[PDB]
Each structure stands twice: as structure tokens, then as C-alpha cells.
Symmetry: none
Subunit: 144 residues, 3 copies
């Protein structure tokens, strides 16, 4: 008796130059029970409470120089609306003073979502993204 609960766990494309592109067409990545991936967005199949999450890993070869801001945000666009309203968001400054550094950003929470809602997981600096290993950059939803 499989669960008919809308789920998604999409991973970053390690090929995408200067961007964060999500894939469902990889090992241990899924899109099930009505969830779609259109224009780098997860599309909500039906109303209900959902658990929403994302992780991104940033890496830079030494802090030198100038102050860097790393944002990671999960946004929602309701049906008939156009602008992304932020659900979860984090701003990290990895530079103390101007040796490789690492900053993981984990966002997660519970949200009531509507049919046709489009969800985005975005970063401001894809030049700092790290996908050497698997499991480092992901985005998903779990229908409760």
C-alpha cells in the first residue's frame, strides 16, 4: 500500500554554469504523486500542509577579498500571483577577515499550501556553490 502523498526531492545539476538547476532525473531524487518540476519550480498538486526543505553548500578558496553575502531562499507564488513571497530565508557572511571555507545553509518548515502553488529554492551566488559530492545541494516537499 504505497503512500499517495505528494513528495519531491530534487538535486542540483553539477553541470549548470553560474546557476542552481534542479533535477528529478537522477539517483535518489524523486517527484511523486502529482508534483511537477516546471521552470526550476516545484508545482503543488493539491491543498494541504507540507513540510518544505532545502540545503545548499557554498565553498570558497580562501576569504580574500571583499565582504561576501550568501543568501538562500525558498519562495512561494500563489495561482493568479506573479511575485515570489519568501517562506524561509537565510543570509550568511563567511568572511571574518580578508585556506578553503565552507558554509552549509539548511532551510525547513511546515506550510499550508494551495493547488497550483509554485515553489522556488534560490541562491544569490552560484559561483560559490559546491557539488563535488552527492547530497550537498537539495530541495524537497512532503505532503503531510
Amino acid at each position: 500500500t504505497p503512500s499517495d502523498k505528494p513528495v519531491a526531492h530534487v538535486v542540483a545539476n553539477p553541470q549548470a554554469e553560474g546557476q542552481l538547476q534542479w533535477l528529478n532525473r537522477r539517483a535518489n531524487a524523486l517527484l511523486a504523486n502529482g508534483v511537477e518540476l516546471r521552470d526550476n519550480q516545484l508545482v503543488v498538486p493539491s491543498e494541504g500542509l507540507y513540510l518544505i526543505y532545502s540545503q545548499v553548500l557554498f565553498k570558497g578558496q580562501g576569504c580574500p577579498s571583499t565582504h561576501v553575502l550568501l543568501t538562500h531562499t525558498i519562495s512561494r507564488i500563489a495561482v493568479s500571483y506573479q511575485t515570489k513571497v519568501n517562506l524561509l530565508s537565510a543570509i550568511k557572511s563567511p568572511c571574518q577577515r580578508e585556506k578553503p571555507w565552507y558554509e552549509p545553509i539548511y532551510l525547513g518548515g511546515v506550510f499550508q499550501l494551495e493547488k497550483g502553488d509554485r515553489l522556488s529554492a534560490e541562491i544569490n551566488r552560484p559561483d560559490y556553490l559546491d557539488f563535488a559530492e552527492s547530497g550537498q545541494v537539495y530541495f524537497g516537499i512532503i505532503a503531510l
Copy 2:
């Protein structure tokens, strides 16, 4: 609710000056399956393992000669007061000198853990310096509980 699991995700009031006031009667904030928000606290409706989480974002326009302390704490009140999760951050490791252009700092504090909780337990997420809270965007300051 199909998954009758007690859940909460409350958000800071960007309007409420010098304080950290939680809201649910707002867009993209909820209380479900028995969770209540009473006197800036989430009230546990039933015994169980819960995930408790909270994020706050502090921002300051340049590090003055001051050596600031930023705390964020999640506490529990049962039918008895206990500290669950706590973090203390010092954003001024090197206080900027007189003659330098003000460089804004950022310090996010995320707290989260799994705790066995009892019916009627009251959870509070508090900070020491609400004057440093950042409301430039939404999705930055929140508090929630998910029953496992």
C-alpha cells in the same frame, strides 16, 4: 487534518518594535492540530517527540567599539521551567576603526532539536537584543514545532 500531527510555524511581527512577537494570523504562518499561541508561546496539545526549531537574524551597521552579545533561547514550561536550546554569538571579533566606512554584519542563529514533550507544555523562543533584528525581507525570523 489527514495527518493529525500537531504542527506550528509562527513568524516575527516586523511592526512590533523592540520585541520579538510571534504571529500565526498571517500569510505563510500556521497553527494546526491543537497547537495554540498564548502569550507569545506555543502550547503543546499532546505528549510526544517533537522537532523544535527557530531562526533569528541579527544585522548591525558596522561593528562599533562595543563587544556585543547576541543570545537566542528556546525554553520549556511544564506543569517547572527548563532551557532546551540556547546559543550566544559575539559579532564583533574585530571592532572596526575610526576612519573606516561602516561595514554591515550579519549573524543568523538557528536552534533546533528533538525533545520529548508533555501535554500543556509552553515553548518560548526569545532574544536579548530585538534592536538588532532584521526585517528587510520575510522568511528570516520564525519559530515552529513538528510532532514526529
Copy 3:
């Protein structure tokens, strides 16, 4: 539905050994009782009394050993560079379609840096959806 929430052994210092209270903990790994969707999660907490000479890398990874192909694949992984006492938590969690017999491991690279002074912060679990 089947569930697990294992916690670190606070006396088993120098190792990340899970303790429990059909999700069976066998050989420090979680065994998938049946086919299906699972939520997998872990939190580890690292602590160090001032930053050392060498640049330290803290990794935390959840891996799958698929019963069918007997191979080890990272499902979720993060890496942190913490370099006065410091505290660094690492959070992992996601939904995965797993098969009966599949093994799950939650591992770290530096157990010497593991803080046992908290249990509400060092756990590993699965929840069948």
C-alpha cells in the same frame, strides 16, 4: 507506520554509536523494514576549545546501501569549516523512496570533536510516510 529515533552513546567517546529506545538498528545502521517513502534526518553537534593550528573540516553524511546493488551512496551530506570555544551543528533531512533491507548510515569524520553534553542535539532517525 514504522519509525526510528536513535541517539548518540554519550559514554562511547571517540565514536558515533547510535542507541535505540520494523525499524531495527543493526550494526550502527537503520534497516528499512519495507518498500516506501521515508523521511530521513540527523543532527550532529561539534565543539572545540579554541581553533587549532591545522584547518579543520567537519563532515556529516547520511548514506544508503541499496540491498539490490550493495553500493554506498550519499543521500544527504554537509561540510563545515569552524576555523574561545566554538559550537557547530550540522542538520540533514530529506524524503527518499527506499527498498526493504536497504541500510542507512549517519556518519561523521571527526568524532574527537563530537559534543555529548547534549542528546536533544545528537540523533538520527527515519519516519515512514
